[PDB]
Design a protein around this ligand. Structure first.
Ligand SMILES: [Zn+2]
Ligand SMILES: [Zn+2]
Lengths: 9, 52
């Protein structure tokens, strides 16, 4: 699949 | 940010993981909210139950 990780603060 | 799974939670913590469905909806989920296990989504094409 197409994955990701969003980095907040 | 909220993703489009049936029983989703909005985490908004430091770093949270997402998966894209390759079964047609191409929408993003959080691995935990759509019952993905990291190994599965990083290994095989991930197709949510809605596209299944
Ligand atoms: Zn889908
Ligand atoms: Zn979600």
């Amino acid at each position: 699949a197409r994955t990701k990780q969003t980095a907040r603060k | 940010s909220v993703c489009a799974a049936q029983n989703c939670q909005r985490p908004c913590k430091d770093k949270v993981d997402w998966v894209q469905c390759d079964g047609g909806c191409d929408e993003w989920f959080h691995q935990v909210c759509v019952g993905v296990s990291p190994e599965m989504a990083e290994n095989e094409d991930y197709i949510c139950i809605n596209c299944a």
